[PDB]
């Protein structure tokens, strides 16, 4: 054996649920692009229809020669009124949810436009530390297999995850305090593996206050300085 | 009556000239050179020069190229250079930058064609 204890950590991420809001400059550029798109476009069918009906009203008022009584029951601008009415009745889903207002950091329904990371709390030598879920490597298993095993040893979940590749995306090696530091147990060598949360969540039984879903910005509050510096390298915030 | 370096018909550019205007455009600057066929630079104007840079909003735009033409035309007349050949690529010749630089040179007095050699 070796002095270092091999570990496999899981970087399970919930990708954004909704699109990110446009920034002030993006809003102006989006307005100009829409303006340019209209200017360089041909008349649409709905525009040509609204034009003819305007002219028909003139031909049925000035010329007074119209030979068609029926014409069309509904006009173009009248049709737009029905469309706008239907839209106002429909109520969209909230992009800012109850969990956002209540700052419930244990739910997956918060910060829908951001990317969340799963942190669990473990006790190490009678000390409460926040870490990315991990498991100790066992013979006859790959280091990725350890990460997939970690997922299956969480507190009552039905989460389905998609692992991306076999290589680790980061590592963190620490040494135990000299009190327990030994030649055979010098320290540990964590190896993180990124995964995507397809579907699922901790059950109400499993929601008992031993995990959080946090963005990369609010990731330091829980992790330690040195552990944080190594996790903030492969956790993107694009 | 001096010999021009004729030949080189299979390569580009021609050597059959006494003086040529050569324009160098970089990512940040515009330089124009008048050089003898033997390779000696006669006169030059570059936006790297403080004398020109201090009056330019940008040293990489069409205005910069036109300014280089006007400055170079004056320096050509003071050096006695009244004729030269210009050997642009097809895309360079069509560009507005080079068209404005050429007009600046001709307005400045320089003729961008050379008189034919007298053989007899």
């Amino acid at each position: 054996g070796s002095p270092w204890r091999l570990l496999g950590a899981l970087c399970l991420q919930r990708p954004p649920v909704v699109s990110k809001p446009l920034t002030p400059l993006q809003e102006e550029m989006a307005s100009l692009l829409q303006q340019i798109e209209i200017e360089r476009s041909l008349y649409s069918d709905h525009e040509l229809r609204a034009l003819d009906e305007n002219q028909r009203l003139a031909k049925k008022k000035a010329d007074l020669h119209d030979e068609e009584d029926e014409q069309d029951i509904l006009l173009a601008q009248d049709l737009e009124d029905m469309w706008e009415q239907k839209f106002l009745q429909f109520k969209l889903g909230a992009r800012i949810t109850e969990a956002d207002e209540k700052n419930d950091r244990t739910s997956l329904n918060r910060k829908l436009d951001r990317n969340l990371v799963l942190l669990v709390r473990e006790k190490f030598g009678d000390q409460d530390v926040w870490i990315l879920p991990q498991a100790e490597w066992q013979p006859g298993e790959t280091l990725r297999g350890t990460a997939e095993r970690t997922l299956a040893t969480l507190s009552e979940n039905n989460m389905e995850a998609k692992f991306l590749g076999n290589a680790p995306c980061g590592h963190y090696t620490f040494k135990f305090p000299q009190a327990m530091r030994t030649e055979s147990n010098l320290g540990a060598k964590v190896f993180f593996f990124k995964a995507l949360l397809l579907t699922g969540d901790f059950s109400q039984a499993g929601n008992k206050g031993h995990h959080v879903w946090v963005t990369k910005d609010e990731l330091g509050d829980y992790l330690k300085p040195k552990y944080l510096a190594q996790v903030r390298r492969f956790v993107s915030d694009l | 009556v001096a010999r021009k370096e004729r030949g080189w018909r299979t390569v580009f550019p021609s050597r059959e000239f006494w003086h040529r205007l050569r324009v160098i455009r970089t990512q940040h600057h515009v330089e124009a050179l008048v050089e003898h066929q033997n390779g000696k630079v006669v006169v030059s104007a570059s936006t790297r020069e403080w004398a020109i840079k201090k009056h330019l909003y940008s040293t990489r735009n069409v205005v910069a190229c036109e300014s280089i033409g006007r400055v170079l035309a004056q320096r050509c007349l003071e050096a006695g250079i009244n004729f030269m050949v210009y050997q642009p690529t097809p895309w360079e010749a069509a560009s507005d930058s080079m068209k404005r630089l050429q007009s600046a040179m001709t307005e400045g007095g320089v003729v961008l064609r050379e008189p034919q050699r007298i053989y007899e």
């Binding site: 990708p15 699109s19 991306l164 590749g165 076999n166 290589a167 995306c169 990124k194 993107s236 694009l238 | -």
Partner: protein
């Protein structure tokens, strides 16, 4: 000249790829993937083309060879809706589905995780990403169906 030390100074054809006159799909090694098709399907044609362009340019920045960039045939779907207090379905809207494919090759095994993380992170709203392994069926699906060959083939059956 052959005898002289400058022999062969004008050699150039060894510096150019051999171009001497459909395409065999290259299965990757144990450390590289084969030809990969990056499908981009969206209900909006501009979003599918804008992202297909983004993926092409991103691959060039990362030195990932882009074998081909092409559009798949558009699929039009009529959307009928049951009318209120009626049993008749009436045409509501016509929705078109536009697909764009960026075919890449030589993607490294270790680098695929990073590449996939970047292109999924930038996916616009309403655009579906599907990265598949290229197969002959995918290429053949881009060509018109031959009814005459089917009838002659049916006789053999």
């Amino acid at each position: 000249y052959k005898t002289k030390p400058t022999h062969g100074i004008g050699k150039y054809k060894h510096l150019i790829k051999a171009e001497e006159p459909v395409r065999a799909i290259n299965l990757g090694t144990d450390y590289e993937y084969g030809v990969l098709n990056i499908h981009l399907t969206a209900y909006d044609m501009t979003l599918a083309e804008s992202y297909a362009q983004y993926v092409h340019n991103l691959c060039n920045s990362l030195s990932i060879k882009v074998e081909e960039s092409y559009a798949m045939p558009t699929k039009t779907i009529e959307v009928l809706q049951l009318q209120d207090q009626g049993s008749k379905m009436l045409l509501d809207s016509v929705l078109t589905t536009h697909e764009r494919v960026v075919q890449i090759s030589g993607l490294s095994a270790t680098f695929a995780e990073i590449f996939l993380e970047i292109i999924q992170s930038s996916l616009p709203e309403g655009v579906r990403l599907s990265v598949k392994e290229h197969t002959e069926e995918d290429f053949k699906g881009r060509f018109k169906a031959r009814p005459e060959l089917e009838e002659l083939l049916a006789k053999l059956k």
